[PDB]
Amino acid sequence: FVDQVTGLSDKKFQRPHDYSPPFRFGTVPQGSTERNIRNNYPYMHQYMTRFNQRGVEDALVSLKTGKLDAFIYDAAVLNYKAGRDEGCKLVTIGSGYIFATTGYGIALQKGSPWKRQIDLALLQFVGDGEMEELETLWLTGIC
Amino acid sequence: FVDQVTGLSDKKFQRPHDYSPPFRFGTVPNGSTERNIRNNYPYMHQYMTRFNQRGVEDALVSLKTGKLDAFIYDAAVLNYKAGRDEGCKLVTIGSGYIFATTGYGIALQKGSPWKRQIDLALLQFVGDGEMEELETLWLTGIC
Amino acid sequence: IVTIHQEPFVYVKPTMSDGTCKEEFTVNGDPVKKVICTGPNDTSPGSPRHTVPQCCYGFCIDLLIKLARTMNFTYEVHLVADGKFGTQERVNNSNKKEWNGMMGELLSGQADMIVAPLTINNERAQYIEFSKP
Amino acid sequence: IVTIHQEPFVYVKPTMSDGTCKEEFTVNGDPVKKVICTGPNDTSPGSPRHTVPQCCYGFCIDLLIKLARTMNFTYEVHLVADGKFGTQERVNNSNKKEWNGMMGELLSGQADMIVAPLTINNERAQYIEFSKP
Amino acid sequence: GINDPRLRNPSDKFIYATVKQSSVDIYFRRQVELSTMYRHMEKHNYESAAEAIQAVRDNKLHAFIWDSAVLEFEASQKCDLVTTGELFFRSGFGIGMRKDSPWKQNVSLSILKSHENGFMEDLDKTWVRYQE
Amino acid sequence: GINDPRLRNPSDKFIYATVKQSSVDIYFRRQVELSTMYRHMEKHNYESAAEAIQAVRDNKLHAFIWDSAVLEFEASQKCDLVTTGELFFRSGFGIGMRKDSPWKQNVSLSILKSHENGFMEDLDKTWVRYQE
Numbered sequence: 117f118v119d120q121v122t123g124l125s126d127k128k129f130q131r132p133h134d135y136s137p138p139f140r141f142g143t144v145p146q147g148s149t150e151r152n153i154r155n156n157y158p159y160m161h162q163y164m165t166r167f168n169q170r171g172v173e174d175a176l177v178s179l180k181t182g183k184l185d186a187f188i189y190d191a192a193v194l195n196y197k198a199g200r201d202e203g204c205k206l207v208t209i210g211s212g213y214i215f216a217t218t219g220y221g222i223a224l225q226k227g228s229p230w231k232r233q234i235d236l237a238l239l240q241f242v243g244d245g246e247m248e249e250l251e252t253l254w255l256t257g258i259c
Numbered sequence: 260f261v262d263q264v265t266g267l268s269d270k271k272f273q274r275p276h277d278y279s280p281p282f283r284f285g286t287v288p289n290g291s292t293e294r295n296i297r298n299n300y301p302y303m304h305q306y307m308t309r310f311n312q313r314g315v316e317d318a319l320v321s322l323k324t325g326k327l328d329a330f331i332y333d334a335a336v337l338n339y340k341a342g343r344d345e346g347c348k349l350v351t352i353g354s355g356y357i358f359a360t361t362g363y364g365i366a367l368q369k370g371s372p373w374k375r376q377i378d379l380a381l382l383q384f385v386g387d388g389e390m391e392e393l394e395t396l397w398l399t400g401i402c
Numbered sequence: 403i404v405t406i407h408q409e410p411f412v413y414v415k416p417t418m419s420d421g422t423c424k425e426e427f428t429v430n431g432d433p434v435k436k437v438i439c440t441g442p443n444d445t446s447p448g449s450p451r452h453t454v455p456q457c458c459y460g461f462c463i464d465l466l467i468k469l470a471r472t473m474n475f476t477y478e479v480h481l482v483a484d485g486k487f488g489t490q491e492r493v494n495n496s497n498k499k500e501w502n503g504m505m506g507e508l509l510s511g512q513a514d515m516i517v518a519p520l521t522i523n524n525e526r527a528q529y530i531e532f533s534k535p
Numbered sequence: 536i537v538t539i540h541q542e543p544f545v546y547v548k549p550t551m552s553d554g555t556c557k558e559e560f561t562v563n564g565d566p567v568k569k570v571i572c573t574g575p576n577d578t579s580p581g582s583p584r585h586t587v588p589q590c591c592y593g594f595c596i597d598l599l600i601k602l603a604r605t606m607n608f609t610y611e612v613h614l615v616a617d618g619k620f621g622t623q624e625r626v627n628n629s630n631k632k633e634w635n636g637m638m639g640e641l642l643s644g645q646a647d648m649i650v651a652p653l654t655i656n657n658e659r660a661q662y663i664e665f666s667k668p
Numbered sequence: 669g670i671n672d673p674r675l676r677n678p679s680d681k682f683i684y685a686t687v688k689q690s691s692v693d694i695y696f697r698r699q700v701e702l703s704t705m706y707r708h709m710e711k712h713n714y715e716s717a718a719e720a721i722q723a724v725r726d727n728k729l730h731a732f733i734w735d736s737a738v739l740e741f742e743a744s745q746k747c748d749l750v751t752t753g754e755l756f757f758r759s760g761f762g763i764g765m766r767k768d769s770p771w772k773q774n775v776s777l778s779i780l781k782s783h784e785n786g787f788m789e790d791l792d793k794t795w796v797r798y799q800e
Numbered sequence: 801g802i803n804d805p806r807l808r809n810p811s812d813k814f815i816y817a818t819v820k821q822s823s824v825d826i827y828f829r830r831q832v833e834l835s836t837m838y839r840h841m842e843k844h845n846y847e848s849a850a851e852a853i854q855a856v857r858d859n860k861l862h863a864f865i866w867d868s869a870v871l872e873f874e875a876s877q878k879c880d881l882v883t884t885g886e887l888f889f890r891s892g893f894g895i896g897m898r899k900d901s902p903w904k905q906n907v908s909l910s911i912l913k914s915h916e917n918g919f920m921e922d923l924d925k926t927w928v929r930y931q932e
């Protein structure tokens with residue numbers, strides 16, 4: 117019930133020598149989160165370049181076995197990983213407050229006639245609680 | 260929690276003159292419950308003739324005023340009436356184990372060809388949780 | 403009649419002296435209505451398999467005795483060859499569906515009335531019929 | 536530009552003396568970049584005619600200032616006449632569901648771009664296009 | 669009960685199964701959201717119920733999926749055996765029958781005659797209600 | 801939150817309503833299974849949200865369906881006003897745009913440029929993020 121890291125721009129995030137143990141974190145390689153970090157903080161990417169890893173569950177095992185302390189990824193995927201966490205041990209930081217705050221969607225070709233139909237259909241699917249039923253079915257936010 | 264009556268075979272159901280408070284038991288008129296009573300205990304029907312009533316909600320009000328002490332009806336209807344009772348001051352006895360233990364069904368004409376399809380459709384509705392979904396929608400499981 | 407050994411329902415117990423059941427009483431002195439069923443063992447190549455008669459009693463057995471008390475009909479209680487209820491299982495050649503267990507002995511004519519802890523569902527009622535539970 | 540009265544998004548205040556706004560400072564000494572909106576006192580039964588240029592600021596106002604600094608355009612900020620978002624409500628003649636509120640002022644040409652806490656749903660997007668939230 | 673989300677993705681610490689080729693297997697094969705447990709418990713199915721009771725008594729398991737009154741009887745036998753609070757697939761044991769046959773009407777009527785009186789209650793007093 | 805059966809079956813003392821002609825009325829009018837609340841919220845529809853805040857502060861309203869930001873801000877301002885946590889109808893606040901118009905793409909890219917940096921964080925630091 118404490119906060120080890122304040123947010124994305126913590127005062128500890130400028131120097132690993134400010135940390136008394138050698139701090140480590142990671143992302144997935146060649147992701148859009150890495151591009152967002154590089155367009156926000158290139159020095160954060162320069163620290164993270166020595167601290168890369170393979171994938172999602174590889175970083176999950178590195179968090180369980182004490183090889184890793186933090187992992188920067190998407191919000192709802194890490195919320196699901198906390199939902200499938202072995203006894204709610206790995207806990208996220210907040211609920212997306214000091215973060216990128218974007219969403220998913222359907223990528224279409226430029227000028228496609230399928231745009232307005234999919235837009236109205238998704239806004240209808242949110243408007244009748246069916247999206248909430250799917251989020252209840254596939255995302256179990258325990259504890 | 261305490262239960263002053265622990266089954267339909269209680270000693271108090273013989274005669275309220277046997278015990279120092281004369282209590283009252285209530286059923287509904289013109290029902291299969293009364294046929295089960297008259298084929299199990301005709302004296303129970305003879306003392307229900309002393310203790311008749313008219314309406315199920317009227318008998319609920321008579322229970323809330325204390326003019327009626329005991330009440331006998333079906334299981335799930337009284338469970339739903341206790342699920343929406345204010346304060347939950349009216350609790351049943353067990354969950355139907357010293358009782359008739361029958362089920363609600365769909366009565367058809369004798370020799371109708373629609374029996375097999377309705378039976379297969381109902382057994383399909385049971386074995387997928389959709390019946391439990393409708394029971395969750397139309398019953399309240401509080402208190 | 404075929405049934406499976408269900409511990410709160412169908413007690414199956416080996417005979418005492420010669421194909422007979424020990425007359426055991428309940429807490430009220432009511433004699434336990436036992437029947438001489440036929441019980442085979444589980445592993446027929448794993449052990450010398452005798453297929454001896456055996457004693458069957460309990461819940462569903464006394465229910466069957468009440469049913470035979472109601473209508474004038476005799477009965478012969480036997481047991482299933484292998485301890486399965488019966489499932490819609492696909493055979494290896496030509497991927498054909500078949501049945502095993504008590505239902506496999508029912509549809510093969512070896513049984514006539516399954517008085518047993520049988521669970522009612524959709525796939526069984528398509529092929530056989532069900533009484534009220 | 537049209538908006539509606541919500542305090543954590545659009546603070547609406549009357550002016551200091553005439554048109555000018557109070558040079559308010561935040562907790563970090565930042566002067567609040569305000570705008571001279573044009574708003575009524577109350578609704579038409581409540582206020583007969585009192586519509587003045589007032590001071591408006593806050594969340595979406597600073598968002599609009601950032602958009603007006605990013606792209607190369609000037610703007611105009613007014614207020615909604617009634618106190619509604621806007622729904623597809625029936626009118627007397629021809630039994631037709633017309634619009635009102637901020638959408639009723641946008642579709643009538645009285646507004647050019649709704650910068651407001653617009654809850655995106657199906658029916659509002661059935662007619663006009665939106666932006667990303 | 670079944671609404672524990674940690675059993676939806678089990679592991680080596682959640683060792684539970686059901687009887688091989690039982691009705692539980694078909695009921696979990698139909699419901700698609702119970703497929704993952706169906707892809708787990710298929711690795712550990714047992715030939716009979718008493719073998720599973722003896723296995724879970726020696727803590728070689730962690731849970732077991734079976735009908736209500738049988739497990740309540742086993743809890744009345746052994747105090748360490750505990751039934752859960754939740755309940756699902758509220759169905760009925762009836763009599764397995766043949767096709768079109770003269771044993772359809774009077775068998776159901778005799779069972780219902782046993783239901784209208786207290787004979788089913790007396791059979792409960794024999795074994796079902798009977799505690800030890 | 802919304803999962804209270806006291807709101808599913810209301811009474812004369814559980815006074816819940818909404819702002820007249822809002823997205824709450826549209827969302828509770830599309831869902832016909834929530835028609836009962838649609839029969840209740842018409843009793844006490846208000847004009848502005850501040851009228852609803854003054855009503856619920858003086859205990860004239862007992863519940864009020866509304867977007868999360870304004871209610872969390874008023875909970876930060878006033879300690880007696882308490883929000884709940886059952887979140888439903890996760891929607892978006894977007895800039896209301898015209899038809900086919902040359903400002904649909906540029907403004908959207910500018911808002912997304914505001915999303916990628918910490919400018920929305922600065923806008924939270926203006927009024928949204930700071931608790932009182």
Ligand SMILES: *[C@@H]1O[C@H](CO)[C@@H](O[C@@H]2O[C@H](CO)[C@@H](O)[C@H](O)[C@H]2NC(C)=O)[C@H](O)[C@H]1NC(C)=O
Pocket residue numbers: 288289
């Ligand atoms: C319950 O059943 C009885 C019998 O139908 C009803 O009692 C009266 O029965 C006589 C028989 O000649 C009729 O003439 C009356 O019309 C019946 N009573 C009335 C006032 O209608 C009785 O009404 C039935 N209803 C209940 C629920 O009590």
Ligand SMILES: *[C@@H]1O[C@H](CO)[C@@H](O[C@@H]2O[C@H](CO)[C@@H](O)[C@H](O)[C@H]2NC(C)=O)[C@H](O)[C@H]1NC(C)=O
Pocket residue numbers: 770771773774
């Ligand atoms: C099922 O039970 C009923 C009980 O009524 C039996 O019906 C009677 O049995 C005789 C046999 O000759 C029939 O002629 C009549 O239909 C019934 N009695 C009369 C005179 O109405 C019925 O036979 C039983 N069926 C079986 C054998 O399962």
Ligand SMILES: *[C@@H]1O[C@H](CO)[C@@H](O)[C@H](O)[C@H]1NC(C)=O
Pocket residue numbers: 443449450451452454
């Ligand atoms: C069946 O079971 C026992 C013990 O497994 C076995 O020795 C024998 O083959 C059968 N019955 C007899 C005769 O004990």
Ligand SMILES: *[C@@H]1O[C@H](CO)[C@@H](O)[C@H](O)[C@H]1NC(C)=O
Pocket residue numbers: 473474
């Ligand atoms: C038993 O069968 C005989 C011969 O068919 C018949 O007379 C009798 O009614 C049947 N019922 C009884 C009393 O068991």
Ligand SMILES: *[C@@H]1O[C@H](CO)[C@@H](O)[C@H](O)[C@H]1NC(C)=O
Pocket residue numbers: 493494
């Ligand atoms: C078919 O294959 C199964 C194993 O899947 C085996 O048990 C069975 O003996 C084979 N043949 C028969 C007789 O069905």
Ligand SMILES: *[C@@H]1O[C@H](CO)[C@@H](O)[C@H](O)[C@H]1NC(C)=O
Pocket residue numbers: 576577581582583585
């Ligand atoms: C606004 O309100 C009243 C009408 O309700 C109007 O008469 C008055 O002049 C106005 N007051 C202010 C704050 O200027």
Ligand SMILES: *[C@@H]1O[C@H](CO)[C@@H](O)[C@H](O)[C@H]1NC(C)=O
Pocket residue numbers: 607
């Ligand atoms: C914006 O437009 C004005 C002319 O209206 C002029 O200063 C120039 O074209 C633009 N300035 C910038 C810096 O975009």
Ligand SMILES: *[C@@H]1O[C@H](CO)[C@@H](O)[C@H](O)[C@H]1NC(C)=O
Pocket residue numbers: 625626627628
């Ligand atoms: C229609 O006119 C009546 C007055 O006759 C008015 O009360 C009502 O609000 C109007 N309804 C519509 C649908 O515009």
Ligand SMILES: *[C@@H]1O[C@H](CO)[C@@H](O)[C@H](O)[C@H]1NC(C)=O
Pocket residue numbers: 902903905906
């Ligand atoms: C939108 O952005 C591009 C960026 O170069 C610019 O060229 C274009 O003119 C803009 N459109 C309008 C209508 O401002």
